[PDB]
Write an enzyme that holds these catalytic residues in place. Structure first.
Site, PDB file in Angstrom:
ATOM      1  N   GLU A  35       0.847  -1.223   0.000  1.00 19.97           N
ATOM      2  CA  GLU A  35       0.000   0.000   0.000  1.00 19.97           C
ATOM      3  C   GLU A  35       0.869   1.255   0.000  1.00 19.97           C
ATOM      4  O   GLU A  35       0.562   2.198  -0.780  1.00 19.97           O
ATOM      5  CB  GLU A  35      -0.917  -0.012   1.218  1.00 19.97           C
ATOM      6  N   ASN A  46      -7.807   8.695  -6.211  1.00 18.76           N
ATOM      7  CA  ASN A  46      -8.577   7.685  -6.977  1.00 18.76           C
ATOM      8  C   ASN A  46      -9.326   8.404  -8.077  1.00 18.76           C
ATOM      9  O   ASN A  46      -9.587   9.602  -7.963  1.00 18.76           O
ATOM     10  CB  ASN A  46      -9.506   6.942  -6.041  1.00 18.76           C
ATOM     11  N   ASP A  48     -12.398   8.438  -8.719  1.00 13.89           N
ATOM     12  CA  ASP A  48     -13.709   8.897  -8.191  1.00 13.89           C
ATOM     13  C   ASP A  48     -13.515  10.180  -7.382  1.00 13.89           C
ATOM     14  O   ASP A  48     -14.535  10.726  -6.928  1.00 13.89           O
ATOM     15  CB  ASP A  48     -14.413   7.772  -7.423  1.00 13.89           C
ATOM     16  N   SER A  50     -11.895  10.402  -4.452  1.00 16.27           N
ATOM     17  CA  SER A  50     -11.496  10.034  -3.073  1.00 16.27           C
ATOM     18  C   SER A  50      -9.970   9.933  -3.048  1.00 16.27           C
ATOM     19  O   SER A  50      -9.351   9.888  -4.112  1.00 16.27           O
ATOM     20  CB  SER A  50     -12.173   8.769  -2.610  1.00 16.27           C
ATOM     21  N   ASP A  52      -6.619   8.035  -0.845  1.00 16.47           N
ATOM     22  CA  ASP A  52      -6.119   7.050   0.150  1.00 16.47           C
ATOM     23  C   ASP A  52      -4.940   7.655   0.928  1.00 16.47           C
ATOM     24  O   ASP A  52      -4.012   8.291   0.298  1.00 16.47           O
ATOM     25  CB  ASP A  52      -5.601   5.821  -0.565  1.00 16.47           C
ATOM     26  N   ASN A  59      -9.101   5.011   2.777  1.00 14.89           N
ATOM     27  CA  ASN A  59      -9.827   5.813   1.762  1.00 14.89           C
ATOM     28  C   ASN A  59     -10.845   6.770   2.394  1.00 14.89           C
ATOM     29  O   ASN A  59     -11.529   6.444   3.385  1.00 14.89           O
ATOM     30  CB  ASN A  59     -10.512   4.875   0.790  1.00 14.89           C
ATOM     31  N   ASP A 101     -15.436  -4.827   9.039  1.00 10.44           N
ATOM     32  CA  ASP A 101     -16.622  -4.326   8.280  1.00 10.44           C
ATOM     33  C   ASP A 101     -17.348  -5.464   7.567  1.00 10.44           C
ATOM     34  O   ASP A 101     -18.488  -5.245   7.128  1.00 10.44           O
ATOM     35  CB  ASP A 101     -16.213  -3.251   7.258  1.00 10.44           C
TER      36      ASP A 101
END
Ligand SMILES: [Cl-]
Ligand SMILES: [Cl-]
Ligand SMILES: [Cl-]
Ligand SMILES: [Cl-]
Ligand SMILES: [Cl-]
Ligand SMILES: [Cl-]
Ligand SMILES: [Cl-]
Ligand code: NA
Length: 129
Positions: A35, A46, A48, A50, A52, A59, A101
């Site tokens: 990562e 990203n 979209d 967003s 990280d 994110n 999650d």
């Protein structure tokens, strides 16, 4: 901060990640390697819009507030900047929420693609833990 491999293994263990949700420390070290390359100040935008953040590239769509991700949540209740600290407490606490999650460490696409099913114990081999 750029952690060493064994240095990050030790910090993650000190903060309770080792075997958290059944994931051995080597899984966490491996995910951090791919990562961020162990760099707390890692960021990635990203498509979209967003972003990280940090050693585990958490994110802004769900987990932290950066003020520039429309329609997003902040489920870790932190500014995304907290994920860039030399102190990994905020990254670890937020990672515990993410891995809880429902999809475990599959939340981290790099873990699924590069760590999952591999000899992840190699990532903590030799380390004084
Ligand atoms: Cl390494
Ligand atoms: Cl391991
Ligand atoms: Cl936002
Ligand atoms: Cl929220
Ligand atoms: Cl905030
Ligand atoms: Cl730390
Ligand atoms: Cl799981
Ligand atoms: Na957000």
């Amino acid at each position: 901060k750029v952690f060493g491999r064994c240095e990050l293994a030790a910090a993650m263990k000190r903060h309770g990640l080792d075997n958290y949700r059944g994931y051995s420390l080597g899984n966490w070290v491996c995910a951090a390697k791919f990562e961020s390359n162990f760099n707390t100040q890692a960021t990635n935008r990203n498509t979209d819009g967003s972003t990280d953040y940090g050693i585990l590239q958490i994110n802004s769509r769900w987990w932290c507030n950066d003020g520039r991700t429309p329609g997003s949540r902040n489920l870790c209740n932190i500014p995304c900047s907290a994920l860039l600290s030399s102190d990994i407490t905020a990254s670890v606490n937020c990672a515990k929420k993410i891995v809880s999650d429902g999809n475990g460490m599959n939340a981290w696409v790099a873990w699924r693609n590069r760590c999952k099913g591999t000899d992840v114990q190699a990532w903590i081999r030799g380390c004084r833990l």
